[PDB]
Design a protein around this ligand. Structure first.
Ligand SMILES: CCOC(=O)c1c(O)c2cc(Oc3ccc(N(CC)CC)cc3)cnc2n(O)c1=O
Ligand SMILES: [Mn+2]
Ligand SMILES: [Mn+2]
Lengths: 554, 400
C-alpha cells in the first residue's frame, strides 16, 4: 500500500501546551508479541518508524481480538492538538444528485495510511511497546502517516483528497465526482464504452498520487447501500424498513420505531409520528413496557399502510423548477412533497415543531414554508415554487394585520382539504348595544389563592375563587368568565397586556386548556371587541373589579 | 512591512458557521474569488486553519460581502480604544451628505502575516457535493473594522489637498464608506463630490445622497377629534401614562376625571375644557426632544422597529429603554422583508451620521425568515448586529 507523494499539511499544538507524556501500562506477553508482529509489518510498509529514548513523548497502546488489532489511545494528544476546520458541514442528500446514464463506485482502501504526516509533528505520535514486566526499555515507534483516531486525520485526508482530484476535475468538466469520507461516486452521461474507460483513467490518476482503488471485477454494483440509502443510477430510496409487530412495546422498541419512521419520512408521504412520540414524553425506564394508546394504534396502522408497498424518489434536473406541496394532517402535523414533474417526488418530509406556547394554522404553515425553503437551498441551490392549502385572501388578511414581518416566495392556492383558515376575528371598533365587561384577576403570591371576575355597565357582576393559580391565570380566567356570561356580542376591557397579546394573535390551538376554552368561546361568538387599560390607575370600570378580586387577596 | 495587529486577550479568532447560499450567489463568489486570487488579494488555505467567517453576495454587478461582525468584536480594542477615527458633530447639521464606497482602497495595503488566518472564509457548495472553497486575506479586507483604522494615515494624505481647498466640507470615514457633507447648493455640492472623486481616482478609487438637516423627530401623536368616546379617552390615558415614563412633566389627572363608574365604551361623553389644557400642553411636549437624554459614548445603541401596516414602519433609537435618542418612521411590488431590510439600512446610516456607530437591532421577524432573505435586498457594505423579538401589542399603537 503506497503512501501519497502529496505535500504535507503543517500541524501545530495548542498554544503553550507540550506533547503527550502518558506512561505505557505493563502488557501481557501475548499482547506484546502481537504488537511486535503488527508493528514490524507497519514499519516495512513505511507506515511507522523506529525512534530512541531521545524522543520524550509517549501515547499508550493496547491489543485486542486468530487476528489482533493494535489500538492507540490518542485522548491526550487529541486534547493537545490544534483545532481544525469542520471536515464537512453536512452529508449530500440523494435527492440533490443529477441523473446519470452510467455510474460507478470507487473507494480508497486504507485511507489514512495512504497519506503522510507533517514531519515536525511525527514526534508527538510516539508510542512504546513494553518489554516483559519491567526489565528492558521498550521498542519506540512514531507515525509517518495519518493515525487512526487522531483528531486531525479526518480533516487532512479530506484536504488531500480535494487537492488530488482538483486537476482531474478540470479537464473533465462534464463528469461529476462526489466524494465523502473514503468513498467516491463517479457519474457521467457517456456510454458504457467510454465510461468504464474514463473511470480506469481516474484510477490511474489516483494511484499516481498514492491512492489505491478496486478495478472492474471488484468495484461495486447498484443498488448502492450508503448512509442508510438505496441508490440506483436513475432513482433512490431508503433502506428496507421493518416494523416488528410486538405483543408488548417497551420504551426502547418505541424509540427505534420513531427513528425508523422519521428516516422513512424522507420519501414515504404522509408518515405520522405524533401519537407514537406522545408516549415517550414524560420520560423514564428504558425497558418498561408502555401500553399503546388507541390513537397510537391507528397511527401505527396508518404507517404500516404507507410502508406496505415500496416508494422511490427521483434525481434532480437543474433546468426544471421545484414544486413544493404541503398538506395539513391534523393538529400540529404537516407533510410535504417536492417534485419537478407532477407527482414524481424528489423527496418528501414532515413538519410538527411547537413554536412557543400558543399558535394557529397560518403561523404553522409559514413556519413549514421557511423550513422547506432552507432545505431546498441546501439541497438544490434554489427555492421551490409552493402550492399551499390556504386561500390568497386568507393569507392576505393575516399578513396585513399581524405585528410580525412575514414572507412566502411564489405560491399558489391548491384545494386540498383540510384548508387553512382563521376561526375568528376581533373587532376594530367598540360594539354599539353590547354589554361592556370590565374584567380583572388577582392572585396572592404566598397563599397562591386567587380571584377572577367582572363588572359590567349593565350592573351585572361575578367573582370566582381559584386555588393553584398565578396572576396571569387569573387574568385569563376573568376573560373566560366574561365570555361565558355575555352572549353573542361583547366588549371586554382588560388591564392584562399578556391576555391581550395571546388573543389578538388569533390562536386556534394551545398547550393551555384554559386558553383552549377561551378559543372555543371566541369562535361561538359573532362580534368580540377587546381593549386594554393601565392597571391601578383608578380607571372607569377597572377600579370596580379591582376592589372585587383584591378583597381577601392583596 | 505591515502594522502588527493583535486580539483581545483570553478570546481568540472567529469560528462562525457559513450560511447556505443559492447557486447564482455561489457562482458569483467563485468568479469574484478566482479573480481576487490571481491578483494575490487572497490565498487558498488548508484545514490547519480552524477559523471561519460568513461570506455573502449582494447587488447589476454581483459583489462580495463578508460578515466580519464576530472578528470585529474580537478586535474591538484595536479599531476603537487604540486607533479610533473620531466623529464630527457637524455632519448631522449639513444640508447635504454624500456617501462614497471607498473600500477598494484596502486592496493595496498588505495585512499582517500573523493576522491573515483570522480572515478565513468558505464558499459552500450545493448539496455538500464538494467541501467548501477556503480562502484567507493577504491585504486589508473590506468590512473589517481594522482596515480603515490602519488606512487612516494614507486616507488623510489623499484628502489633504481637497480638505485644504474646501474648509467647509466635512469628510468622515466609517468602515468602507466616506461621508461627505456641505451646506452648499445641491448643484455645487454634486460638483464638489465630482471633484472629490477625481482625487480618489488618482489613488485608484471610486453618489447616493442624504439630507440630514431635514431630519425631524416623529412626535407621539394624540388624536385631534370632536366628539370623544369612552374608549378614546381610555386609549388616550394609556398613551399618556406610558409617555410619562419617558417625557418629564407629562400630565394626565384631568383626563382620568372623565372616566368614573363602569361606563360603556361607545357612550359619548361631552368633554370638559381643563382636560383640553392637558391635551394641548402634552402635544407641545410630545413634539420636542426628550429632556434629560444624552448619547453615552461607552454604551451600545439599540434600535427597535414596529410594523404599522400599509407599508409603514415606526422606529426608536435609545440606550436606556424608552429614553429615546431619536424616533422616526419608514414608508414604501413590495414585501415585508424587503421593507424591513430597507428600514434597517436607513436607520443604520442615520445612526452612523449622528453617532458614529451602528445600533443593535431588535427585529419583529422570525430568525429564519430574516436569515434566508435579508441578503436579497441588502445593499450596504456593513452589517449591524441583530436580535429577534416579539413586538408588544401596545408599543405598536403608542407609536401611532
Ligand atoms: C451491492 C453490495 O455492496 C454493498 O453492500 C455496499 C455498497 O453497494 C456501497 C456503495 C457505495 O456507493 C456510494 C459511494 C458514494 C456515495 N455518495 C457519497 C459521495 C453519495 C453520492 C454513495 C454511494 C458506497 N458504499 C457501499 N458499501 O459500503 C457497501 O457495503
Ligand atoms: Mn390585572
Ligand atoms: Mn387588578
Amino acid at each position: 500500500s503506497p503512501i501519497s507523494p502529496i505535500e504535507t499539511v503543517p500541524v501545530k499544538l495548542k498554544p503553550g501546551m507540550d506533547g503527550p507524556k502518558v506512561k505505557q501500562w505493563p502488557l501481557t506477553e501475548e499482547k506484546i508479541k502481537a504488537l511486535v508482529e503488527i508493528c514490524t509489518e507497519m514499519e516495512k510498509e513505511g507506515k511507522i518508524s523506529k525512534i530512541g529514548p531521545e524522543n520524550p513523548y509517549n501515547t499508550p497502546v493496547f491489543a485486542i481480538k486468530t487476528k489482533w488489532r493494535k489500538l492507540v489511545d490518542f485522548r491526550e494528544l487529541n486534547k493537545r492538538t490544534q483545532d481544525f476546520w469542520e471536515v464537512q458541514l453536512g452529508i449530500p442528500h440523494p435527492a440533490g444528485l443529477k441523473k446519470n446514464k452510467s455510474v460507478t463506485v470507487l473507494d480508497v482502501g486504507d485511507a489514512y495510511f495512504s497519506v503522510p504526516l507533517d514531519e515536525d509533528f511525527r514526534k508527538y505520535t510516539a508510542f512504546t511497546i513494553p518489554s516483559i514486566n519491567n526489565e528492558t526499555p521498550g521498542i519506540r515507534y512514531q507515525y509517518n502517516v495519518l493515525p487512526q483516531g487522531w483528531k486531525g486525520s479526518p480533516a487532512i485526508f479530506q484536504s488531500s483528497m480535494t487537492k488530488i482530484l482538483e486537476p482531474f476535475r478540470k479537464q473533465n468538466p462534464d463528469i461529476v465526482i462526489y466524494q465523502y469520507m473514503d468513498d467516491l461516486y463517479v457519474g457521467s452521461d457517456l456510454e458504457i464504452g467510454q465510461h468504464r474507460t474514463k473511470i480506469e483513467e481516474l484510477r490511474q490518476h489516483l494511484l499516481r498520487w498514492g491512492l489505491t482503488t478496486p478495478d472492474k471485477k471488484h468495484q461495486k454494483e447498484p443498488p448502492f447501500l450508503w448512509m442508510g440509502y438505496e441508490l440506483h443510477p436513475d432513482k433512490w430510496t431508503v433502506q428496507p424498513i421493518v416494523l416488528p409487530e410486538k405483543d408488548s412495546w417497551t420504551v426502547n422498541d418505541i424509540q427505534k420505531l420513531v427513528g425508523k419512521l422519521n428516516w422513512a419520512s424522507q420519501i414515504y408521504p404522509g408518515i405520522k409520528v405524533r401519537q407514537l412520540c406522545k408516549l415517550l414524553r414524560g420520560t423514564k425506564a428504558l425497558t418498561e413496557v408502555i401500553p399503546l394508546t388507541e390513537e397510537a394504534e391507528l397511527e401505527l396502522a396508518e404507517n404500516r399502510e404507507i410502508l406496505k408497498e415500496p416508494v422511490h424518489g427521483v434525481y434532480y434536473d437543474p433546468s426544471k423548477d421545484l414544486i413544493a406541496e404541503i398538506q395539513k394532517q391534523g393538529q400540529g402535523q404537516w407533510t410535504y412533497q417536492i417534485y419537478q414533474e407532477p407527482f414524481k417526488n424528489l423527496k418528501t418530509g414532515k413538519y410538527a415543531r411547537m413554536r412557543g406556547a400558543h399558535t394557529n394554522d397560518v403561523k404553522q404553515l409559514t413556519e413549514a414554508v421557511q423550513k422547506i425553503t432552507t432545505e431546498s437551498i441546501v439541497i438544490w441551490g434554489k427555492t421551490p415554487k409552493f402550492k399551499l392549502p390556504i386561500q390568497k385572501e386568507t393569507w392576505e388578511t393575516w399578513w396585513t394585520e399581524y405585528w410580525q414581518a412575514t414572507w412566502i416566495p411564489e405560491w399558489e392556492f391548491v384545494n386540498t382539504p383540510p384548508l387553512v383558515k382563521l376561526w375568528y376575528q376581533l373587532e376594530k371598533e367598540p360594539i354599539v348595544g353590547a354589554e361592556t365587561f370590565y374584567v380583572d384577576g388577582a392572585a396572592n403570591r404566598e397563599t397562591k389563592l386567587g380571584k377572577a371576575g367582572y363588572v359590567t355597565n349593565r350592573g351585572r357582576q361575578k367573582v370566582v375563587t381559584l386555588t393553584d393559580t398565578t396572576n396571569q391565570k387569573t387574568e385569563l380566567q376573568a376573560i373566560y368568565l366574561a365570555l361565558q356570561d355575555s352572549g353573542l356580542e361583547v366588549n371586554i376591557v382588560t388591564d392584562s397586556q399578556y391576555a391581550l397579546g395571546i388573543i389578538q394573535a388569533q390562536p386556534d390551538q394551545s398547550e393551555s386548556e384554559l386558553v383552549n376554552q377561551i378559543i372555543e368561546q371566541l369562535i361561538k361568538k359573532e362580534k368580540v371587541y377587546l381593549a386594554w387599560v393601565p392597571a391601578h390607575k383608578g380607571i372607569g370600570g377597572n377600579e370596580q373589579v379591582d376592589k372585587l378580586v383584591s378583597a381577601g387577596i392583596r | 512591512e505591515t502594522v502588527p495587529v493583535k486580539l483581545k486577550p483570553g478570546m481568540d479568532g472567529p469560528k462562525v458557521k457559513q450560511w447556505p447560499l443559492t447557486e447564482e450567489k455561489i457562482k458569483a463568489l467563485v468568479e469574484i474569488c478566482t479573480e481576487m486570487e490571481k491578483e494575490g488579494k487572497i490565498s487558498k488555505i488548508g484545514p490547519e486553519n480552524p477559523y471561519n467567517t460568513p461570506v455573502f453576495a449582494i447587488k447589476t454587478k454581483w459583489r462580495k460581502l463578508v460578515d466580519f461582525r464576530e472578528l470585529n468584536k474580537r478586535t474591538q480594542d484595536f479599531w476603537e480604544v487604540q486607533l479610533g477615527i473620531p466623529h464630527p458633530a457637524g455632519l448631522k447639521k449639513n444640508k447635504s451628505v454624500t456617501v462614497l464606497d471607498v473600500g477598494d482602497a484596502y486592496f493595496s495595503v498588505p495585512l499582517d502575516e500573523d493576522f491573515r488566518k483570522y480572515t478565513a472564509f468558505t464558499i459552500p457548495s450545493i448539496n455538500n457535493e464538494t467541501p467548501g472553497i477556503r480562502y484567507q486575506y493577504n491585504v486589508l479586507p473590506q468590512g473589517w473594522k481594522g482596515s480603515p483604522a490602519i488606512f487612516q494615515s494614507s486616507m488623510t494624505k489623499i484628502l489633504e489637498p481637497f480638505r485644504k481647498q474646501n474648509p467647509d466640507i466635512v469628510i468622515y470615514q466609517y468602515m468602507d464608506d466616506l461621508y461627505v457633507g456641505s451646506d452648499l447648493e445641491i448643484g455645487q455640492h454634486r460638483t464638489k463630490i465630482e471633484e472629490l472623486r477625481q482625487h480618489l481616482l488618482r489613488w485608484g478609487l471610486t453618489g447616493y445622497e442624504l439630507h440630514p438637516d431635514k431630519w425631524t423627530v416623529q412626535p407621539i401623536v394624540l388624536p385631534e377629534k370632536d366628539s370623544w368616546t369612552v374608549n378614546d379617552i381610555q386609549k388616550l390615558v394609556g398613551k399618556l401614562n406610558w409617555a410619562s415614563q419617558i417625557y418629564p412633566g407629562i400630565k394626565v389627572r384631568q383626563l382620568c376625571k372623565l372616566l368614573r363608574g363602569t361606563k360603556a365604551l361607545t357612550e359619548v361623553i361631552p368633554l370638559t375644557e381643563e382636560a383640553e389644557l392637558e391635551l394641548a400642553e402634552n402635544r407641545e411636549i410630545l413634539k420636542e426632544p426628550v429632556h434629560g437624554v444624552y448619547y453615552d459614548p461607552s454604551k451600545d445603541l439599540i434600535a427597535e422597529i414596529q410594523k404599522q401596516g400599509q407599508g409603514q414602519w415606526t422606529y426608536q433609537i435609545y440606550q436606556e429603554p424608552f429614553k429615546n435618542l431619536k424616533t422616526g418612521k419608514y414608508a414604501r411590488h413590495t414585501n415585508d422583508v424587503k421593507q424591513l431590510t430597507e428600514a434597517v439600512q436607513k436607520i443604520t446610516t442615520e445612526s452612523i451620521v449622528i453617532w458614529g456607530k451602528t445600533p443593535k437591532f431588535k427585529l419583529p421577524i422570525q430568525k429564519e425568515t430574516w436569515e434566508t432573505w435579508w441578503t436579497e435586498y441588502w445593499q450596504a457594505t456593513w452589517i449591524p448586529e441583530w436580535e429577534f423579538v416579539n413586538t408588544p401589542p401596545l408599543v405598536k399603537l403608542w407609536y401611532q
